[PDB]
Design a protein around this ligand. Structure first.
Ligand SMILES: CCCCCCCCCCCCCCCCCC(=O)OC[C@H](CO[C@@H]1O[C@H](CO[C@H]2O[C@H](CO)[C@H](O)[C@H](O)[C@H]2O)[C@H](O)[C@H](O)[C@H]1O)OC(=O)CCCCCCCCCCCCCCCCC
Ligand code: CLA
Ligand code: CLA
Ligand code: CLA
Ligand code: CLA
Ligand SMILES: CCCCCCCCCCCCCCCC(=O)OC[C@H](COP(=O)(O)OC[C@@H](O)CO)OC(=O)CCCCCCCCCCCCCCC
Ligand SMILES: CC1=C(/C=C/C(C)=C/C=C/C(C)=C/C=C/C=C(C)/C=C/C=C(C)/C=C/C2=C(C)CCCC2(C)C)C(C)(C)CCC1
Ligand SMILES: CC1=C(/C=C/C(C)=C/C=C/C(C)=C/C=C/C=C(C)/C=C/C=C(C)/C=C/C2=C(C)CCCC2(C)C)C(C)(C)CCC1
Ligand SMILES: CC1=C(/C=C/C(C)=C/C=C/C(C)=C/C=C/C=C(C)/C=C/C=C(C)/C=C/C2=C(C)CCCC2(C)C)C(C)(C)CCC1
Ligand SMILES: CC1=C(/C=C/C(C)=C\C=C/C(C)=C/C=C/C=C(C)/C=C/C=C(C)\C=C\C2=C(C)CCCC2(C)C)C(C)(C)CCC1
Ligand SMILES: CCCCCCCCCCCCO[C@@H]1O[C@H](CO)[C@@H](O[C@H]2O[C@H](CO)[C@@H](O)[C@H](O)[C@H]2O)[C@H](O)[C@H]1O
Ligand SMILES: CCCCCCCCCCCCO[C@@H]1O[C@H](CO)[C@@H](O[C@H]2O[C@H](CO)[C@@H](O)[C@H](O)[C@H]2O)[C@H](O)[C@H]1O
Ligand SMILES: CCCCCCCCCCCCO[C@@H]1O[C@H](CO)[C@@H](O[C@H]2O[C@H](CO)[C@@H](O)[C@H](O)[C@H]2O)[C@H](O)[C@H]1O
Lengths: 78, 37, 334, 32, 450, 39, 60, 341, 37
């Protein structure tokens, strides 16, 4: 029945497991929190913040139309 | 129209009376298990 | 001994080739009536003024329809929820014009399928079976009652019930989406989960049982001849099927008890279809699917579209063109 | 505002109240 | 008392089935659940009061219990304006405290009382096979149900009355002094067709009819209670029915399914016992209001609303019903059986009267029609008002929509419960609820079908 | 908690389920506040 | 004013003590001779608190 | 011991997660596809490809997020991260919708790896590979819908977006532009899927209600053991029941289960053939006899012609927003609409 | 709104309706503690 690995019900009912995870799982939570709250996700993925959907010189949808020079196209779209 | 209405009322009432009187006529005992109740 | 008891024994007989029963004494007349009127109306009914605006819709084969476009058209919006039998019409032609065949077919059909569910219980009781096949059949029954009865009641007209045809069903679905946003309703999503998962699990069950068949035939004949009707023994290796499926995903995701597996196979699409029947039955009262239209705004306040906004553009295009001549006021209140 | 603070504190007390009962009856040996 | 599956044969997900033959614990489960019902009533009323703007309509604020209290004539005046916040709070406080009492009692019987009541008293001890004791309990519950119906009658007749939406001068809390004791009217409400224009009992249109029916219901229930206490079940009833706890549960499930369906239709269609000042307009009311609103607007623009023909050839504002009554035009032709206190002033003997429409429309009827048309029971699951193509700025779903949808779903799932328990009761009384016996499999002794 | 070196698994389950309910409730709260709330 | 608020806070706190204590005392039978009188007393105390809250509701 | 056979030993161990030779294709590709979808629906916009917000970062919910299709300007460019569009820039690659071919390609190769895993585990366990043959249906659906439909169309833009409301958009788009309900290949798909759901429900209910009394508990689930030889339910009783209820019944267990396989797989294959037709705009859009009549006779109305009008209205009201690269300016007076709405 | 003297415990009133789901889920908590017997 057991393929060789420690059973999960044994693992998650241990003191040492929860000593390691009481730290790892919340601190991964705060790592995702600081990814969003420091604003790094916007710069990493190119997602507009709520005030860069439209700029003062572009009020329409910035639909890409270039096929190869899209970097300059996104730049002049801002 | 009145004749069709009377005929349909009679047919529907006869089938509904059949249904009711059949389920009143010891339908629990019409089973292959224990028919005492 | 008595004539009535002899009739009761014939009615409840398990030796009838088609079981009748007391539910069958209501099922057979209603279903035969609905079948005969549906066939006659689908072939040769004259056009029906479904919207109650003197704009009759040709539904039958003799009036220019094919099989796909043919329908028994729902009764007139002028009738509404009013009971419209033949004897309430001044003539048969008036009855046909106002959509009386739809009311006749739908009412006898709904009684017949409720009696089919009762008859399924009845025969399970006479055969010494467990009784809950009728519970599984109550999910298609609830869906049929939702689209033929409950949605007309909530909308206030039998003209809003699903038409008895293929293209009429498509018309019902498209108008449903434009008005209730059924795709965004989670009960319809649960229904899609029910039918997609039911087909998935049907394919899984069938493929695992066919995969683990015990060798009882040569390579020439069909493998189905490895099973004899009424054999005591199992025709397939469930332990082999479980070993395969608990290595395909992992060990504890696979059923080993066949009874739990078959209860799951019954319960999943039945619960999904129950939920989608209740979704249609609750959009009868205009509790509609999610409205996320203009949910995202920028910091100035301008609307940033999502896929729900494009879906709403499609819904508007479906709505402004539906029943094009029936609306006189700015809002489609029902 | 302090209204979500009080709301979540009342919610926290009531969500802990049940498992506290079950946990006390498990720990002290209740007829569970 | 078995509390595990080896000692009962019921798994944990069927674990309350272990309570079938344990009467005192079963009484405790009931009382504890009753306490849950009264707890929700009290706590939800306190929530609704705490989330109540009384100068705002109740149907605008997602309230379902305050309309019920206001329909009884508590804290309200003419046209449903809330004069006093306190009676709603009192009803909430009373349910919440009685629920504390009921929860203590349910937990006592479920966790410390006699597990079986038949070894303590012959009055509360019940065996499911004992037809006389179960009919006695029917009789007790019937007597108290008749007393509750008479309590509603006492409230409407001797304790300040109820809200009459049809009252002259507008709807108000009025005392019903002449309830209809006529059995013809009361029981011909039962013989009316459950279809358009007749509506069975959903079409009860006046507070006098409701109160007279509740006097009749109280008399019928008290007489039937004394009946089941004084009589044993007759031979036809004993030969037709299954006599077991699961059977009685399934009978009650079928009745509950019926009652949930009827309540959904009742809150959807009736505006007398569910007044539109509290529950909002019905779907029919809002559609007729839209037609009336645009009739009034186009008449103010000089349009001849009688002679105006629409694009289809029917009248744009006024048309004929299939029996010839003068009704509003457009899709609302389907809602021509709608009756409301804002519209009955403009109805003549033949339908909507032209003279009254020409020179008897009051500004309050215009205001009421605009409000009802813009509060039609149409809304997204996330509570976005209007048609589903509307954008997100109107936070509204009608209480009629919520109540009808909920109680239709509950009625369906309780029909499913009836089927599950009626079938299991028959299978268990017949002895094959656990499966087919291999030695005595019944199909194996039957002739072949062909 | 009632054992030697061990936590009851139902305590672990109730803690994990409370956390899952909490993050689901937070995600449903964010439907009515901040971005995507239509206000 | 604040005296009624103190009474209501005492009522909700004693309800918290009762909702902790009632199922524990009804599922601890070996402590029943300890649990039964206090529970009796507790019920009486709870009832008195309800009444005095009502009285202060018509005194405030 | 050769290194290949030693690696074959290690890959096909009996562990918690079986790897196999197929796992080297399945697990990195499925992980890439799933992580790409979760990454796109959490962080990546569709603002420059669609003019839409489609991530949780922008405030969309689980229904309204998608890895949306790339811009129509790219055509059927595979849109590699190192490709001539993105030019190695990960941020530009995210903005131009490169996560869509990333997810779609890795997903397609992961689906290949999964059917290879089905083949490998079926061979190792010693059973027939009918699970892989059944899984041919979903891969046919994925290949026809997410790959050959946009390949037949102008770009990857018109592929379905990997999202809930994006898929709902694709669904409504195919109704309004293709009349996909009217297509008989979709009708066979619908018949197959509803029949598979019917067969699942009916088969489970029949087995659970023809169970043999093989235990003393009301809980019938403990009256089964996997190593038993005899059937847990009565096929004879089930056959007699459905013969008297429905008229016909299954009398062969193996044929029953092959049919439960056959119905939804055949439905998926038939709907895939229809989607292949729709890729080239080869629709069952119209019944020309009824349009010729309706153009000549203004008294002729069917439900088909009403559906045609619905499709026209949807197309005109949706296309400026659904295809913003086209710059469809439809003034309000050209929009088809009925009276008063 | 609530009466003014009862405006101290408005958040508790806000959380009071949901306690039935807490009861329904506590049934599962108790069945987990006793072992789903
Ligand atoms: C065993 C039992 C067998 C019983 C058989 C009897 C039939 C049952 C099914 C009835 C179907 C009726 C079809 C038409 C319904 C309808 O026109 O409308 C509903 C009617 C109400 O009728 C309406 O009633 C209204 C009454 O309001 C009137 O009076 C009011 C007074 O305030 C207002 O003034 C209002 O404006 C005014 O119009 C109007 O007359 C409407 O025109 C009229 O249509 O319901 C009613 O009478 C009563 C409620 C009917 C049942 C509700 C549906 C239950 C469905 C369950 C599905 C289960 C599925 C399970 C699957 C597995
Ligand atoms: C309305 C809901 C409801 C009610 C009233 C009951 C009631 C009951 N169930 Mg039950 N049950 C339910 C839902 C409910 N159940 C659900 C949803 C499931 C599926 C998980 C089950 C599965 C189940 C099983 C498997 C069993 C029962 C059993 C029982 C009976 C005794 C319980 C016991 O002895 O152990 C006691 C449990 C505890 C002491 C844990 C503490 C729980 C307490 C009571 C919480 C409530 C206290 C409250 C917070 C205090 C308020 C009081 C006041 C101060 C305000 C009892 C009458 C047993 C039985 O059949 O009896 C022979 C049994 O075997 N049930
Ligand atoms: C449907 C509800 C119900 C039923 C049938 C019972 C039945 C029973 N209880 Mg129980 N109980 C309940 C609810 C119920 N109880 C509630 C809510 C509480 C909390 C207060 C209790 C707390 C309780 C305790 C502590 C005890 C019992 C006991 C008993 C048993 C004997 C009682 C007796 O005959 O003495 C005689 C009966 C009377 C003197 C009748 C007096 C009239 C009542 C009490 C007042 C009227 C009620 C109310 C004001 C009217 C309307 C109700 C309102 C909500 C609308 C009996 C089987 C005893 C036992 O366990 O048996 C050994 C026991 O000691 N019960
Ligand atoms: C909810 C309270 C309640 C309950 C649980 C019962 C329960 C019972 N009663 Mg009782 N009864 C009650 C209230 C109640 N009654 C009241 C309030 C009165 C005063 C009028 C009576 C007067 C009464 C009498 C005279 C008799 C009973 C009898 C019975 C027993 C069998 C009845 C039966 O077989 O049903 C089924 C009924 C039939 C199969 C007959 C056909 C009825 C048709 C099908 C009804 C059509 C309804 C239709 C579908 C719905 C439309 C609504 C409207 C048009 C009617 C049963 C234990 C019988 C008994 O055993 O005596 C002790 C008996 O003879 N009761
Ligand atoms: C008051 C009416 C009533 C009563 C007293 C019973 C009583 C009983 N039923 Mg029944 N049943 C009913 C109505 C009722 N049922 C309805 C309306 C349905 C249709 C859905 C059923 C379908 C049904 C089935 C399929 C079975 C029973 C069974 C049982 C027995 C044990 C069940 C148990 O332990 O609970 C256990 C409770 C749980 C395991 C948890 C249930 C929670 C559900 C699944 C979801 C809750 C949804 C709710 C609205 C809250 C939403 C939460 C969401 C926000 C997350 C028991 C005697 C069993 C039986 O036949 O034994 C004799 C059984 O197999 N019933
Ligand atoms: C308590 C939950 C009950 C809700 C009803 C749904 C379950 C029944 C549906 C089956 C329909 C098909 C009928 C034939 C199928 C058939 O005949 O079933 C047979 C099967 C065998 O049961 P047994 O006879 O061994 O035991 C049941 C009773 O006889 C006594 O326990 O019945 C069950 O398993 C009932 C268990 C339901 C209890 C848990 C199920 C919870 C599922 C729903 C959860 C919510 C879903 C939505 C969430 C998103
Ligand atoms: C048996 C059993 C069970 C059940 C249980 C139950 C069902 C219960 C209950 C219970 C109940 C039913 C309860 C209750 C309560 C209540 C209370 C405790 C109250 C109160 C009060 C107060 C304190 C109030 C206050 C106030 C006022 C005066 C007004 C203002 C506001 C406020 C709120 C502050 C279960 C399932 C778990 C399982 C196990 C066994
Ligand atoms: C309050 C009110 C009112 C009144 C009402 C009344 C007076 C009533 C009643 C009622 C009644 C008085 C009823 C009833 C019922 C009945 C039922 C619901 C039944 C049934 C059935 C059954 C259940 C049966 C079954 C069966 C069969 C079918 C056969 C065989 C045997 C058996 C048993 C199986 C009015 C509207 C005026 C006004 C408003 C309010
Ligand atoms: C894109 C890309 C990539 C990849 C990445 C990856 C592969 C990753 C990932 C990732 C992942 C893999 C993520 C994740 C996630 C997740 C989430 C977001 C979750 C969730 C959830 C939830 C919310 C749930 C809830 C619930 C339900 C509903 C059911 C039951 C209960 C509970 C509460 C549990 C690289 C760098 C290569 C390069 C560039 C491109
Ligand atoms: C009125 C009032 C009150 C009362 C309250 C009450 C009436 C009570 C209660 C209570 C309760 C009633 C609590 C509870 C709870 C709970 C919970 C927290 C639950 C849950 C959970 C979970 C998470 C679960 C999970 C699971 C599942 C479902 C699956 C398997 C198993 C397990 C366990 C893992 C007070 C005193 C505050 C104060 C005054 C006011
Ligand atoms: C066994 C079950 C029962 C079967 C036995 C009963 C048979 C049917 C009896 C009812 C017969 C028809 O009942 C009768 O229908 C006619 C329909 O013309 C109604 O008549 C009503 O409508 C007609 C037109 O539709 C009008 O011209 C008439 O002035 C009006 O009264 C009567 O009001 C009703 O008394
Ligand atoms: C309304 C119903 C009126 C009741 C009619 C039946 C009265 C008959 C009295 O007889 C009762 O029933 C049947 C007759 O079928 C007998 O058998 C029972 O032993 C007796 O309890
Ligand atoms: C959940 C997954 C997390 C996603 C990963 C997070 C990081 C995303 C990228 C942000 C990093 C910097 O963002 C962008 O990175 C690319 C590499 O792709 C850099 O690009 C640079 O190197 C690449 C590779 O040769 C070439 O295009 C070019 O030489 C130059 O532009 C950009 O100058 C920088 O603007």
């Amino acid at each position: 029945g057991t393929t060789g690995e420690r059973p999960f019900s044994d693992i998650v009912t241990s003191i040492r497991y929860w000593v390691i995870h009481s730290i790892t799982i919340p601190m991964l939570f705060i790592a995702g929190w600081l990814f969003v709250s420091t604003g790094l996700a916007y710069d990493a993925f190119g997602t507009p913040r709520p005030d860069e959907y439209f700029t003062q010189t572009r009020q329409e949808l910035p639909i890409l139309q270039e096929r190869y020079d899209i970097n300059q196209e996104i730049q002049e779209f801002n | 129209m009145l004749t069709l209405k009377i005929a349909v009322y009679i047919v529907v009432g006869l089938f509904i009376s059949l249904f009711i009187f059949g389920f009143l006529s010891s339908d629990p005992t019409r089973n292959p298990g224990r028919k005492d109740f | 001994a008595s004539l009535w008891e002899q009739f009761c024994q014939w009615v409840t007989s398990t030796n009838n080739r088609i079981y009748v029963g007391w539910f069958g004494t209501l099922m057979i007349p209603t279903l035969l009536t609905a079948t005969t009127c549906f066939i006659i109306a689908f072939i040769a009914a004259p056009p029906v003024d479904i919207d109650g605006i003197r704009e009759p819709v040709a539904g039958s084969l003799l009036y220019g329809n094919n099989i796909i476009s043919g329908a028994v058209v729902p009764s007139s919006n002028a009738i509404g929820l009013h009971f419209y039998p033949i004897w309430e019409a001044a003539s048969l032609d008036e009855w046909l014009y106002n959509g009386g065949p739809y009311q006749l077919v739908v009412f006898h059909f709904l009684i017949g399928i409720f009696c089919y569910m009762g008859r399924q219980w009845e025969l399970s009781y006479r055969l010494g079976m467990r009784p809950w096949i009728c519970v599984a059949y109550s999910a298609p029954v609830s869906a049929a009652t939702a689209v033929f009865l409950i949605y007309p009641i909530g909308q206030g007209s039998f003209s809003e019930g699903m038409p008895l045809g293929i293209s009429g069903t498509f018309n019902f679905m498209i108008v449903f989406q434009a008005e209730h946003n059924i795709l965004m309703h989670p009960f319809h999503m649960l229904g899609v989960a029910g039918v997609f998962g039911g087909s998935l699990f049907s394919a899984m069950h069938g493929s695992l049982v066919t995969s683990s068949l015990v060798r009882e035939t040569t390579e020439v004949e069909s493998q189905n001849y490895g099973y004899k009707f009424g054999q005591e023994e199992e025709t397939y290796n469930i332990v082999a099927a479980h070993g395969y499926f608990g290595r395909l995903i992992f060990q504890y995701a696979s059923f080993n008890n066949s009874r739990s597996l078959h209860f799951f196979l019954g319960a999943w699409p039945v619960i999904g279809i129950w939920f989608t029947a209740m979704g249609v039955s609750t959009m009868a009262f205009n509790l509609n699917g999610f409205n996320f239209n203009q949910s995202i705004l920028d910091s100035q306040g301008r609307v940033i579209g999502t896929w729900a906004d494009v879906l709403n553009r499609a819904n508007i295009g479906f709505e402004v063109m539906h029943e094009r001549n029936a609306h006189n006021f700015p809002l489609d209140l029902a | 505002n302090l209204e979500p603070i009080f709301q979540l504190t009342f919610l926290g007390l009531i969500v802990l109240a049940g498992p506290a009962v079950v946990f006390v009856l498990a720990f002290r040996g209740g007829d569970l | 008392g078995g509390r595990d599956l080896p000692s009962t044969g019921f798994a944990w997900w069927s674990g309350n089935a272990r309570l079938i033959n344990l009467s005192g614990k079963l009484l405790g489960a009931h009382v504890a659940h009753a306490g849950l019902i009264v707890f929700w009533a009290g706590a939800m009323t306190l929530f609704e009061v705490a989330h109540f703007i009384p100068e705002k309509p109740m149907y605008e604020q997602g309230l379902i219990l305050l309309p019920h209290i206001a329909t009884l004539g508590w804290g309200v005046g003419p046209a449903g304006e809330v004069t006093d916040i306190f009676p709603f709070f009192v009803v909430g406080v009373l349910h919440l405290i009685s629920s504390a009492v009921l929860g203590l009692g349910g937990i006592y019987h479920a966790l410390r009382g006699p597990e079986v009541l038949e070894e303590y008293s012959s009055f509360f001890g019940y065996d499911w096979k004992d037809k006389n004791q179960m009919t006695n309990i029917i009789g007790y519950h019937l007597i108290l149900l008749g007393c509750g119906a008479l309590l509603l009658v006492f409230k409407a007749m001797f304790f300040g009355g109820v809200y009459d939406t049809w009252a002259p001068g507008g709807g108000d809390v009025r005392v019903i002094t002449n309830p209809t004791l006529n059995p013809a009217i009361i029981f011909g409400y039962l013989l009316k067709a459950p279809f358009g224009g007749e509506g069975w009992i959903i079409s009860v249109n006046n507070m006098e009819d409701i109160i007279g029916g509740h006097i009749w219901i109280g008399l019928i229930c008290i007489s039937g209670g004394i009946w089941h206490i004084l009589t044993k079940p007759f031979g036809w009833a004993r030969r037709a029915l299954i006599w077991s706890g699961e059977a009685y549960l399934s009978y009650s499930l079928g009745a509950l399914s019926l009652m949930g369906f009827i309540a959904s239709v009742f809150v959807w269609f009736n505006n007398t016992a569910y007044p539109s000042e509290f529950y909002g307009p019905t779907g029919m009311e809002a559609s007729q209001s839209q037609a009336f609103t645009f009739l009034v607007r186009d008449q103010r623009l000089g349009a001849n609303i009688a002679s105006a023909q629409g694009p289809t050839g029917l009248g744009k504002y006024l048309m004929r019903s299939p029996s010839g009554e003068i009704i509003f035009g457009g899709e609302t032709m389907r809602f021509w059986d709608f009756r409301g206190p804002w519209l009955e002033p403009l109805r003549g003997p033949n339908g909507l009267d032209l003279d009254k429409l020409r020179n008897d429309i009051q500004p309050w009827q215009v205001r009421r029609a605009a409000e009802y048309m813009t509060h039609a029971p149409l809304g997204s699951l996330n509570s976005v008002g209007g048609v589903i193509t509307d954008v997100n700025s109107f936070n509204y779903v009608s209480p009629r929509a919520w109540l009808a949808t909920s109680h239709f779903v509950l009625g369906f799932f309780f029909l499913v419960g009836h089927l599950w328990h009626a079938g299991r009761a028959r299978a268990a009384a017949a002895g094959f609820e656990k499966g087919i016996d291999r030695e005595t499999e019944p199909t194996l002794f039957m002739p072949d079908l062909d | 908690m009632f054992a030697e070196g061990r936590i009851p698994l139902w305590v672990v389950g109730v803690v994990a389920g409370i956390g899952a309910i909490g993050v689901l409730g937070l995600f449903f709260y964010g439907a009515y506040a901040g971005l995507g709330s239509s206000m | 004013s604040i005296v009624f608020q103190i009474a209501l806070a005492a009522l909700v706190l004693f309800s918290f003590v009762m909702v902790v204590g009632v199922p524990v005392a009804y599922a601890s039978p070996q402590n029943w001779d300890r649990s039964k009188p206090l529970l009796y007393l507790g019920s009486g105390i709870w009832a008195i608190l309800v009444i005095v809250v009502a009285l202060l509701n018509f005194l405030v | 011991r050769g290194w290949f056979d030693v690696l074959d030993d290690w890959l096909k161990r009996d562990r918690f997660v079986f790897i196999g030779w197929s796992g080297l294709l399945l697990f990195p590709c499925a992980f890439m596809a799933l992580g790409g979808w979760l990454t796109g629906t959490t962080f990546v916009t569709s603002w420059y490809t669609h003019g839409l917000a489609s991530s949780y970062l922008e405030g969309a919910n689980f229904l309204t997020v998608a890895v949306s299709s790339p811009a129509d300007a790219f055509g059927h460019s595979l849109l590699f991260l190192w490709g001539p569009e993105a030019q190695g820039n990960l941020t530009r690659w995210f903005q131009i919708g490169g996560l869509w071919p990333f997810v779609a390609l890795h997903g397609a190769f992961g689906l290949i790896g999964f059917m290879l895993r089905q083949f490998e585990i079926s061979r190792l366990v010693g059973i027939r590979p009918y699970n892989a043959i059944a899984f041919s249906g979903p891969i046919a659906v994925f290949v026809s819908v997410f790959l050959m439909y946009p390949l037949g169309q102008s770009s990857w833009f018109f592929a379905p977006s990997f999202g809930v409301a994006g898929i709902f958009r694709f669904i409504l788009f195919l109704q309004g532009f293709h009349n996909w309900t009217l297509n008989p290949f979709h009708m066979m798909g619908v018949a197959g899927i509803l029949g598979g759901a019917l067969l699942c429900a009916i088969h489970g209910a029949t087995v659970e209600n023809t169970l043999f009394e093989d235990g003393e508990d009301s809980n019938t689930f403990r009256a089964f053991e996997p190593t038993q030889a005899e059937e847990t339910y009565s096929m004879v009783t089930a056959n007699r029941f459905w013969s008297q209820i429905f008229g016909i019944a299954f009398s062969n267990k193996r044929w029953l289960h092959f049919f439960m396989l056959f119905v939804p797989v055949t439905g998926l294959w038939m709907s895939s053939v229809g989607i292949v037709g729709l890729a080239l705009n080869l629709r069952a859009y119209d019944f020309v006899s009824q349009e010729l009549r309706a153009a000549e006779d203004p008294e002729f109305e069917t439900f088909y012609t009403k559906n045609i009008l619905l499709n026209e209205g949807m197309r005109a009201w949706m296309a400026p927003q659904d295809q913003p690269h086209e710059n469809f300016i439809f003034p309000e007076e050209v929009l088809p609409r009925g009276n008063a709405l | 709104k609530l009466p003014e003297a009862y405006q101290i415990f408005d958040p508790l009133v806000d959380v009071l309706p949901v306690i039935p789901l807490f009861f329904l889920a506590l049934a599962f908590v108790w069945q987990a503690a006793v072992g789903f017997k």
